[PDB]
Amino acid sequence: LECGLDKNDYFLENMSIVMNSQDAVPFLLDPSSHMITVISNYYGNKTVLLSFLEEGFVKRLENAIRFGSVVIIQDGEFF
Amino acid sequence: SPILGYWKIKGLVQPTRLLLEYLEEKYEEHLYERDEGDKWRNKKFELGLEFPNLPYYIDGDVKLTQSMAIIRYIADKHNM
Amino acid sequence: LGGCPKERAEISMLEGAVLDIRYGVSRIAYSKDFETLKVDFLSKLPEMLKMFEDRLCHKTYLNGDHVTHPDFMLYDALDVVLYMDPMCLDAFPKLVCFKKRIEAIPQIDKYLKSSKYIAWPLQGWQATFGGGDHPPFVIEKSLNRIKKFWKEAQYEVIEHSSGLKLVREWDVLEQACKEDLEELVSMKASNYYKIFEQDCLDLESKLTKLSEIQVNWVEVQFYWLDLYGILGENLDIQNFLPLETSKFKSLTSEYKMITTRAFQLDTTIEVIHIPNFDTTLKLTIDSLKMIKSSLSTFLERQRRQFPRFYFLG
Numbered sequence: 124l125e126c127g128l129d130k131n132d133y134f135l136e137n138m139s140i141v142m143n144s145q146d147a148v149p150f151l152l153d154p155s156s157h158m159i160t161v162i163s164n165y166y167g168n169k170t171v172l173l174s175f176l177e178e179g180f181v182k183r184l185e186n187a188i189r190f191g192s193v194v195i196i197q198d199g200e201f202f
Numbered sequence: 203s204p205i206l207g208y209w210k211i212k213g214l215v216q217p218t219r220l221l222l223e224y225l226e227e228k229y230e231e232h233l234y235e236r237d238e239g240d241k242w243r244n245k246k247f248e249l250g251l252e253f254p255n256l257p258y259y260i261d262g263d264v265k266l267t268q269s270m271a272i273i274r275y276i277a278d279k280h281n282m
Numbered sequence: 283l284g285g286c287p288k289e290r291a292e293i294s295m296l297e298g299a300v301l302d303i304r305y306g307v308s309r310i311a312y313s314k315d316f317e318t319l320k321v322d323f324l325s326k327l328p329e330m331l332k333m334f335e336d337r338l339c340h341k342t343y344l345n346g347d348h349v350t351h352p353d354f355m356l357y358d359a360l361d362v363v364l365y366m367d368p369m370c371l372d373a374f375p376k377l378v379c380f381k382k383r384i385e386a387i388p389q390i391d392k393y394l395k396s397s398k399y400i401a402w403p404l405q406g407w408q409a410t411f412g413g414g415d416h417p418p419f420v421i422e423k424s425l426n427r428i429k430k431f432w433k434e435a436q437y438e439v440i441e442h443s444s445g446l447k448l449v450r451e452w453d454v455l456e457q458a459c460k461e462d463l464e465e466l467v468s469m470k471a472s473n474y475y476k477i478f479e480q481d482c483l484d485l486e487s488k489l490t491k492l493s494e495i496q497v498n499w500v501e502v503q504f505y506w507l508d509l510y511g512i513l514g515e516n517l518d519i520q521n522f523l524p525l526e527t528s529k530f531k532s533l534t535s536e537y538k539m540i541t542t543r544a545f546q547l548d549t550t551i552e553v554i555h556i557p558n559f560d561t562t563l564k565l566t567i568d569s570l571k572m573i574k575s576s577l578s579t580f581l582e583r584q585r586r587q588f589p590r591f592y593f594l595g
Binding site for chain 1: 421461464465
């Protein structure tokens with residue numbers, strides 16, 4: 124909440140689902156990209172944003188994997 | 203006459219050279235000159251030694267490279 | 283010992299030759315000169331390993347179907363060279379096997395997992411290679427690929443109709459620099475790069491300065507090439523613009539010496555170490571852009587005199 128998650132019981136449940144279990148990659152859908160910033164406040168400097176449409180996608184993710192970078196991929200539709 | 207390969211110099215075969223001269227055993231040399239590196243690369247791998255290398259000794263189907271395997275051979279050829 | 287005098291002496295000869303390799307490693311491992319020596323070692327290594335790959339054709343272990351002593355010698359060597367290089371085996375599957383085979387022997391495998399096993403270091407703790415308390419991991423391996431690429435940097439150079447020599451095909455190095463720079467930024471996210479941290483900061487400052495001169499240099503190269511079409515060839519054009527051609531040729535001298543000094547270096551990275559390069563190019567591009575801008579004002583003032591010229595272009 125302190126980052127800026129919404130008070131809603133729905134949105135708390137959702138966040139709990141995303142965080143609590145990570146044996147699998149979570150897919151976030153939100154029209155208002157207020158959630159993209161929530162996870163950014165949680166992981167801070169380590170937060171690296173990419174998108175499956177961008178040019179250097181190919182390489183930048185290889186750099187993200189190698190050094191423990193917490194990654195959010197901006198266009199999940201395109202994969 | 204057995205065949206000893208090394209640079210035209212004392213290098214890693216010197217002791218062996220002495221031993222040979224000690225046992226008054228005759229031999230012939232494959233000598234690498236100062237700027238003769240080609241000549242080496244020319245024979246380097248087509249010699250059929252157990253490990254190609256320098257120096258090398260070759261006699262009665264005794265192919266030796268590794269200064270130790272070589273020296274021991276000369277030594278053994280005189281029961282030593 | 284083996285089957286017979288011959289096979290027993292053969293097993294001893296293997297002992298010897300294996301040590302001539304295991305030892306070769308440790309003699310350049312205490313040296314401060316390690317980081318650059320490995321290159322020439324790993325290149326020779328193949329020829330030595332090869333002999334063993336052959337021996338291992340139609341044999342289950344070195345020297346036959348039963349495990350022999352030389353197999354345990356080569357295994358020590360192997361075990362040690364794989365820590366230095368993880369891909370020492372990759373090019374020789376028959377050895378990758380021999381290695382796993384040893385590790386597979388129930389007794390051995392049970393041992394490596396036991397309390398009796400001393401797992402690491404490889405060489406006396408003082409040694410440069412494989413010493414110290416705990417093995418580091420990838421950060422160095424990647425930084426080495428970055429440094430390697432930059433002490434090979436090669437630019438298509440082609441001299442055109444007149445004096446100066448041109449740098450063609452910008453993109454490849456253009457891209458590489460920016461990518462390898464983004465790589466160092468992501469290295470800050472890693473846990474164990476704090477003290478190894480400092481060196482990378484030096485290589486980061488070296489490449490961030492290479493992109494500083496990369497940005498301006500492509501601009502210079504483009505805007506000179508463009509202006510050469512316009513003023514470099516005719517007498518009529520330079521007749522109308524005298525202050526412009528007298529100032530173009532003065533820059534043409536400087537950049538001709540700047541390129542030929544930078545080309546003969548043979549290392550594009552080495553260019554950041556050259557005296558007054560970012561300052562020289564920033565001066566050159568400024569003046570080249572003042573000429574382009576002067577021509578622009580001349581052509582439009584020509585067009586306003588006879589407003590048909592607006593139609594022409």
